[PDB]
Amino acid sequence: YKLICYYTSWSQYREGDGSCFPDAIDPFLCTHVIYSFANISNNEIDTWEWNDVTLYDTLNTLKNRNPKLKTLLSVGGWNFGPERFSAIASKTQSRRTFIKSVPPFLRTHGFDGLDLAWLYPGRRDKRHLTTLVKEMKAEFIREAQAGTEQLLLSAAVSAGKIAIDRGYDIAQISRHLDFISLLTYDFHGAWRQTVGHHSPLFAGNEDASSRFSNADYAVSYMLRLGAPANKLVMGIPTFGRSFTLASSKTDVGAPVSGPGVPGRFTKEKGILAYYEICDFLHGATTHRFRDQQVPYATKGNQWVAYDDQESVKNKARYLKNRQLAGAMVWALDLDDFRGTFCGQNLTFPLTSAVKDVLAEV
Ligand SMILES: CC(=O)N[C@@H]1[C@@H](O)[C@H](O[C@@H]2O[C@H](CO)[C@@H](O[C@H]3O[C@H](CO)[C@@H](O[C@@H]4O[C@H](CO)[C@@H](O[C@@H]5O[C@H](CO)[C@@H](O[C@@H]6O[C@H](CO)[C@@H](O)[C@H](O)[C@H]6NC(C)=O)[C@H](O)[C@H]5NC(C)=O)[C@H](O)[C@H]4NC(C)=O)[C@H](O)[C@H]3NC(C)=O)[C@H](O)[C@H]2NC(C)=O)[C@@H](CO)O[C@@H]1O
Ligand SMILES: *[C@@H]1O[C@H](CO)[C@@H](O[C@H]2O[C@H](CO)[C@@H](O[C@@H]3O[C@H](CO)[C@@H](O[C@@H]4O[C@H](CO)[C@@H](O)[C@H](O)[C@@H]4O)[C@H](O)[C@@H]3O)[C@H](O)[C@H]2NC(C)=O)[C@H](O)[C@H]1NC(C)=O
């Protein structure tokens, strides 16, 4: 089983305990650690933060303590304009330019692979996405001839039915990619005036209608479309999405005024880190959708949809039962990495819970 974990570039800037640097990562926790995100300048991959080469270096030293650990650099991300990927990929010339610039960059900074996070490809992009993947892999195969271990190519893919149908030729890119990370956690939060969980495992017979917005459907779909199970990796969130209630109602379908109040450390309306959620639970009412098998909490007028050790162990069992390649976690720096916010003294409680199930039979 693979355990793919993302570490974000911008987490170093959070104040106090929220600050997270690469050396806080347990080397033996995941099998693959992906650094987010790289930029693209002059059609070449490039750094993003002023100190990335130092952090790249700190992250890759982890391999001195654990030789089996693989690291990858991810390009793209939500805040990355998909138009930019679109323009680079639709022109054979700028596409070859970006592709050719990737291996030397990865080899200089000690990475073992590239992760593609184009979010998201439209109907007019499908054909070019397939090309970027093909040519990128061909180039990695070419590059291994020099006697080095071949570079890995992976991609983070939307788990939304319409998004998949619209921009991805799953059967094609599946044969060229080493693994595919299913983003099974942004199903409900897309500013949509009402309450709901963003990462349910199952559909649940109540208020069913977007029968497609749950992990079980997304996995089943990807498999029907042609992706091999041994290359699929299910995404497991380490954060929660919050809402500000518009009334005293707390059950499903309850109206919402907008996103939740920022977290003290993450300072971003709408989301909370697992460690902030831990603090938040004191004096809150915790509920759990049986059908969807995920929890939520309320306090005053705030409503939070999140994942705990139990829902995360549950998802890991599901994933083993369908024989997938493993799990993907977003993100290490949103988990209780210091291990001093959630109680039972454990560093990375959520990710460790996923690791324990995977390590079981
Ligand atoms: C919200 C929503 O609806 N979107 C979701 C998507 O998120 C989702 O995408 C996938 O799933 C992840 C979670 O859903 C998703 O989220 C993450 O993506 C973006 C980036 O792509 C993250 O954006 C953060 O936002 C930060 C602000 O909150 C911002 O922080 C600022 O960062 C800069 C530098 O990075 C700091 O500047 C530096 O400051 C110091 C001094 O302070 C100086 O010394 C430096 O020189 C400064 N200069 C610079 C520029 O370096 C600044 O301090 C800091 N603070 C501020 C002002 O707040 C980050 O920069 C920015 N990151 C980027 C790259 O833009 C989101 O926060 C992430 N969300 C969560 C949650 O973590 C991923 O993109 C994606 N994952 C995968 C697998 O790819 C999609 C579904 O895919 O669904 C929705 O669209
Ligand atoms: C990620 O890579 C991106 C490049 O592909 C890059 O985004 C930008 O990259 C350039 C660097 O800033 C931008 O260039 C500038 O654009 C402005 C026009 O608005 C021009 O005029 C001015 O320049 C003045 C100083 O010289 C400044 O005071 C003014 O405010 C004004 O900006 C500049 O001369 C310059 O050309 C690119 O336009 C932009 N790329 C795209 C496609 O939009 C990011 O910088 C890079 N790293 C990150 C985001 O961390």
Report the distance separating Cα 289 and Cα 12, nearest Å: 34
User: Amino acid identity, residue 269?
Assistant: K
Non-local CB neighbours of 282 within 8 Å, separated by 6+ positions: none
280 contacts 304 by C-beta, under 8 angstroms: yes
Q: Looking at the structure, tell me whether residues 30 and 44 fall in a common domain.
A: yes
**Alpha carbon of 184 to ligand 1 centroid (Å):** 19
Atom of ligand 1 nearest to the CA of 189: 3
329 contacts 5 by C-beta, under 8 angstroms: yes
Report the distance separating Cα 162 and Cα 143, nearest Å: 36
CB atoms within 10 A of CB 25: 23
- The pick from 10, 35, 48 for probing ligand 1's pocket by mutation, whose C-beta has the most ligand atoms within 8 angstroms, reads 10
Q: How many helices (H) and strands (E) does the chain have?
A: 10, 15
The alpha helices in the chain, defined as continuous H runs, are 52-65, 82-89, 92-108, 126-144, 161-167, 170-176, 215-224, 274-280, 309-321, 349-359
| Atom 4 of ligand 2, nearest CA residue | 41
Q: Please name which ligand lies nearest the alpha carbon of 48.
A: 2
Q: Which two tokens stand for residue 220?
A: 């089943």
CB atoms within 10 A of CB 125: 21
Residue 57 phi, psi (nearest 5): -65, -40
User: Amino acid identity, residue 179?
Assistant: F
| Atom 14 of ligand 2, nearest CA residue | 41
- The pick from 8, 9, 13, 39 for probing ligand 2's pocket by mutation, whose C-beta has the most ligand atoms within 8 angstroms, reads 39
Residue 66 phi, psi (nearest 5): -135, 100
Q: Looking at the structure, tell me whether residues 318 and 351 fall in a common domain.
A: yes
Burial of 148 (0-12, 13-18, 19+ CB in 10 A): exposed
Q: Looking at the structure, tell me whether residues 21 and 71 fall in a common domain.
A: yes
Q: Which amino acids are annotated as binding site for chitin, given as ranges?
A: 49-50, 76-79, 120, 183-186, 241, 330
Q: Which two tokens stand for residue 3?
A: 């355990």
Which residue do the tokens 């990335």 mark?
52
Contacts 24+ apart (CB under 8 A), 294-300: 294/197, 294/199, 294/200, 294/201, 296/197, 298/245, 298/250
Q: Looking at the structure, tell me whether residues 221 and 284 fall in a common domain.
A: no
Report the distance separating Cα 236 and Cα 244, nearest Å: 24
Give the CATH number of the domain where residue 55 resides. Answer: 3.20.20.80
Q: Please name which ligand lies nearest the alpha carbon of 94.
A: 2
Which residue do the tokens 């030729």 mark?
169
Burial of 21 (0-12, 13-18, 19+ CB in 10 A): middle
**Residues flanking ligand 2, CB < 6 Å:** 39-41, 48
Q: Which two tokens stand for residue 41?
A: 């300048």
Q: Looking at the structure, tell me whether residues 106 and 181 fall in a common domain.
A: yes
User: Amino acid identity, residue 145?
Assistant: Q
Experimental method, per PDB record: X-ray
DSSP 296-360: EEEETTEEEE---HHHHHHHHHHHHHTT-SEEEEE-GGGS-SSS-SSSS--SSHHHHHHHHHHH-
- Rounded to 10°, the helix 92-108/82-89 angle is 110
Q: Whole-angstrom distance between the N-terminal and C-terminal Cα of the chain?
A: 11
**Alpha carbon of 79 to ligand 1 centroid (Å):** 6
Domain containing residue 90: 1-238+307-361
Q: Looking at the structure, tell me whether residues 55 and 191 fall in a common domain.
A: yes
Report the distance separating Cα 314 and Cα 316, nearest Å: 5
Torsion over CA: 236, 106, 51, 27 (sign)? positive
Mark which of 266, 290, 306 sits at the end of a domain.
Answer: 306
Q: Which two tokens stand for residue 273?
A: 């880190």
